[PDB]
Design a protein. Sequence first.
Length: 15
Amino acid sequence: GSKYSDTADESSYRW
């Protein structure tokens, strides 16, 4: 769910 970085979508971003 492309946006700020993390660990919940695109193996990179968060919802």
